[model samples]
Target: VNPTVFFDIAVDGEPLGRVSFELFADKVPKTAENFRALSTGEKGFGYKGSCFHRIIPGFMCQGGDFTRHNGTGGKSIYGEKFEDENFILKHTGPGILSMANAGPNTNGSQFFICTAKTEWLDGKHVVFGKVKEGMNIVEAMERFGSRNGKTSKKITIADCGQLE
Candidate 1:
């Protein structure tokens, strides 16, 4: 079976629900490795307490900027930005997970989950995984997330790690 990771989400420091993802290591190994390592807190950096900094209706939900707790700052386990692993993956629909970056080859700790198809972002961002479960929570984030896409209620990741 493909390797999976689970994320426990919270709002206002209260439990919301769990979101699970299945990684495509074969398609984008480096990007997947970065996500897996960060999700699992393997090197003291993880999604725990990270907020869904940006949420756009009919688009996607962006987060994983644990450093600045916003969209502007984050890094990989390597302690710096890394190259983009663009592949044949498509942002065909909602529930897709892709890396967030400032530009090409600047992938780091940030990532986003598509709430709807975003073909325009296909080559611009690296699609690394998909939501295997709890997309409703994502929808909730979209609905309750700040109008400007920032969460004031503190949408946080309570726990994140590889599934056995």
Candidate 2:
């Protein structure tokens, strides 16, 4: 079975909801592995207290920048920036989870939740997951985002880990 993970979100310290994800490990093992361990926080530093630094309506919301808590910083399990694990998974619709990178071959810890269809991003980013549960929660997060991708309120990953 694919490993499932969750992010318990908080908007300005108030509980928002939980958004769960399903890894596409069968197709993108390397990318999925990074997401799994990071969510589990098995390495001590993960998404705990991390903020979704960038968000845009009709686009996507992103996080995993545990270093700076902004789009500028993050670290992967293997290090800062890993190779693309192949984009066999397409960004067909909303709630798709994909890596956010600087450019080609710059995959890091940052990932995003799609709120719209972004098929053009296929092969440019690794699509490694889907919102397994709580798509409504994802929608809730989008409400806090601006057109420029800056969030008006602090949206936090209050807790995150593998679900039993």
Candidate 3:
């Protein structure tokens, strides 16, 4: 059986904060399970050396590329199964976590965390989780450096484990 997933977005090797979110088992069971499998059966592997590929202040910050250290490469080739009903998620708000993809149903293992309100992403991306705490960390990362809201600040998931 799969369990709930939690994350702590830290910076400079300190326990900065965390985000709590519920997996979308009902909406996109296969895709959601694929993600959960990475943490559960795989021993929460593959994310240790990953980096935050893209960041857009007042918009979003994308990672989970699963390829380049801080680049836009991912498991896109082995895309996820798409459920029309599960596409109701939005990239809106500052804490939403959604799957990344090239096109509809093309999501692989890539996911992103938002730092600002972006309601325009509704019905486009899959909503899997959201941050429960430490949104300021995302905000701080956004403030440092950005090219017209698009920043290159890199973030690594470091560790992903159960909250209890």
Best by TM-score: 2
The residue pairs found clashing in candidate 2 are none
Candidate 1 regions with alpha-carbon error over 4 angstroms:
none
- Can you tell me which runs of candidate 3 are displaced by over 4 Å? 1-3, 10-15, 40-45, 76-85, 148-153
**How many residue pairs clash in each candidate at the backbone level?**
0, 0, 4
Q: Is candidate 1 or candidate 2 better by lDDT?
A: 2
Better of 2 and 3 by TM-score: 2
Task: Give candidate 3's TM-score.
Answer: 0.74
Q: Give the candidates in order of lDDT, highest first.
A: 2, 1, 3
lDDT of 3 by residue, 84-139 (tens): 33756666677887877767766766777777666777777777766655667666
Tell me each candidate's TM-score: 0.95, 0.97, 0.74
Estimate the overall C-alpha local distance difference test score of candidate 1: 0.87
Per-residue lDDT of 46-161 in model 2, one digit per residue for the tens?
A: 78889998899889999889998878888889866899889788999999999999999898899999999999999899999999899999999999999888999999999999
Q: Select the stronger candidate by TM-score from 1 and 3.
A: 1
Local error of candidate 2 at residue 118 (angstroms): 0.5
lDDT of 1 by residue, 40-117 (tens): 998987888788888777788898999998788888987689988776799999999999899988988999999888
